[PDB]
Amino acid sequence: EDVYQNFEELKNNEDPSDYGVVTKETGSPVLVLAIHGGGIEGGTSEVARELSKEYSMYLFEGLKSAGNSVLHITSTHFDEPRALKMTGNHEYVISLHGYAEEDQQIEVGGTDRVRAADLVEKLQHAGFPAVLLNMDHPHAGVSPNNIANKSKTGLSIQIEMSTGFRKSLFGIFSLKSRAVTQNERFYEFTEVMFRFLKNSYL
Ligand SMILES: [Zn+2]
C-alpha cells in the first residue's frame, strides 16, 4: 500500500518543499521517466538527469530528510499533471525504478517486448547484470493504467535496478551527494544506455 492514491492527495498532504517535479522537453521521440526519484528510489534521479543530456525527461523526486517512502505513488496510480502531459507528448517511454535487493541486478520489463529483450542483451554483453521479465511476471509494467504506457504508441521499457546495483554507481549514496560523486561505473552504464537508445529508436 502507498500512502496516497493519486497526486492530488499527495499535494494536499505534503509541504511542497518536500518533493519536486522536474521536466526537460526536447521533442525527442523517447521520454525518460523517473516517478520515484530523490530519496524514494535513490539513484533514479541521477540516472534520469544524465540521460536528459540527450532525451526528454520527467522526474518526480522525494526531497525529505527522511520518510520519502510516503511519497511513492505506484505507476498505475501516478497522475501528476505534468507527467500526463509529457507522456502523451512522446512516442516511447523508458521508466526508471529501484527495488530492494543487495545483490547487483537489473530487471527489465515493459510493453515493448522487442526493445526490452534487445536492451537486456546489450546490458549482458556489456557485463551488466540484467534479466528480462516476461508478461506474467508481477509488476511487469504492462497495465494501460501505468503512467509509462500513456504515450502515443503505448510502448515502454521498465528498468528496475536493485539497491546493490544503484549503490555501485556513486561514491556517496545520499540525497545530497549522489549527484556529485558519480563514478566510472555510472558513466559506463549510462553510456551503454545512450548507445542503446540512439540505435533502437531511429
Ligand atoms: Zn518505482
Q: Could you tell me the residue range of the domain that residue 74 belongs to?
A: 1-202
Cell digits of residue 15:
509541504
Cα–Cα dist 202/190, whole Å: 19
Cα–Cα dist 45/173, whole Å: 12
Cα–Cα dist 60/19, whole Å: 7
CA 158 to centroid of ligand 1, rounded, Å: 10
Question: How far, in whole angstroms, is CA 156 from its chain's centroid?
Answer: 11
CA 128 to centroid of ligand 1, rounded, Å: 20
60 C-beta neighbours (distance < 10 Å), count: 29
Provide the residues around ligand 1 (an ion) whose CB is within 5 A.
36, 41, 97
Cα–Cα dist 33/114, whole Å: 19
Cα–Cα dist 176/112, whole Å: 34
Give the technique used to solve this structure: X-ray
Side chain identity at residue 83, one-letter code: A
CA 98 to centroid of ligand 1, rounded, Å: 6
The gap between the terminal CA atoms of the chain, to the nearest Å, is 39
Return all residues near 72 (Cβ < 8 A) that are at least 6 apart.
Answer: 2, 3, 36, 40, 41, 62
Side chain identity at residue 34, one-letter code: A
Nearest to 40 by CA among 21, 56, 12: 21
CA 68 to centroid of ligand 1, rounded, Å: 12
For the chain, give the longest Cα–Cα distance.
46
Spatial strand order of the sheet with 106-109 comes to 19-24, 56-62, 30-38, 92-99, 155-162, 106-109, 130-132
Say if residues 2 and 75 touch (Cβ distance below 8 Å).
no
Number of domains in the chain: 1
Q: In a 10 Å sphere around its CB, with 0-12 CB exposed, 13-18 middle and 19+ buried, how is residue 101 labelled?
A: middle
DSSP the chain: --S-SSHHHHHHHS-GGGEEEEEE----SEEEEEEEEETTSTTHHHHHHHHTTTSEEEEEEE--SS-GGGG---GGG---HHHHHHHHT-SEEEEEEEE--SS--EEEESS-HHHHHHHHHHHHHTT--EEE--TTSTT-S--TTSGGG-SSS-EEEEEEEEHHHHHTTBSS-STTTGGG-B-HHHHHHHHHHHHHHHHHT-
Say if residues 140 and 152 touch (Cβ distance below 8 Å).
no
CA 161 to centroid of ligand 1, rounded, Å: 9
